[PDB]
Amino acid sequence: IVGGQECKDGECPWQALLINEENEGFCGGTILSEFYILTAAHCLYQAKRFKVRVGDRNTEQEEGGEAVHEVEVVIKHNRFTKETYDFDIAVLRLKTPITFRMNVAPACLPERDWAESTLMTQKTGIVSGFGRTHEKGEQSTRLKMLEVPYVDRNSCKLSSSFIITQNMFCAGYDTKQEDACQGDSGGPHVTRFKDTYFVTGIVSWGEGCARKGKYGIYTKVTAFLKWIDRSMK
């Protein structure tokens, strides 16, 4: 996350961290239930093997509430394409269930039509993660969040050097130096409605981070709400 702020205790409890063959974070995810994590399909190619950490806010401190879970099943979207990042979505089933607690709780899955009319029409959503704090920088050791404006699709397409499919949306700022970044990849974009946070996006890609005239690109979760339900059984 470039700009934004550190997540306060209890404020980002749906954040998951995928950890590679080093206990190093390389992507985010979103807690959906005791057994399921939502992430980006493109993250699955970035480490041969990985585990999921929940409850972490500071990767350099053993607070005591963190827990690591192994992955039992990876359910990648069967139309995911590395060339365009179209269909950039996956669900992970964990081998053991998450115990919800301080800093560990699921984000809500909204009903589709209402999400389209009511969530995607809000001014902003929130993105979070442990990703880089500037494009050429290093990952944050502390969990950050950022309020990102929804950006209309026509503006989105004109801004981009690459195709923006209807499975994607833009969020963020034209010139203000705030954005998601590498390492936030796969993590949550949620939208608040009367103090309840609903899953609306997955951090997918960008042309650099916080560049002038570029936006962050997110997987459009409304397009996949039925797919998520099926994937979770």
Binding site: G10, R101, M102, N103, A105, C108, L109, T118, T196
Partner: protein, 54 residues
């Protein structure tokens, strides 16, 4: 009555019928007797920040 004005007074999901609105809630909540509010069924309902240390 309409979902476009104050979300039909629903706490969460709103859908319009011929004359009325119908409210509903995400899993882990029960729609209240008033037909509008969503009541959590457990201590870590989806979408809520964990601010009351139990």
């Amino acid at each position: 009555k309409l979902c476009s004005l104050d979300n039909g007074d629903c706490d969460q999901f709103c859908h319009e019928e011929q004359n009325s609105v119908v409210c509903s809630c995400a899993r882990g909540y029960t729609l209240a007797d008033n037909g509008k509010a969503c009541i959590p069924t457990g201590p870590y309902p989806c979408g809520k920040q964990t601010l009351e240390r139990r």
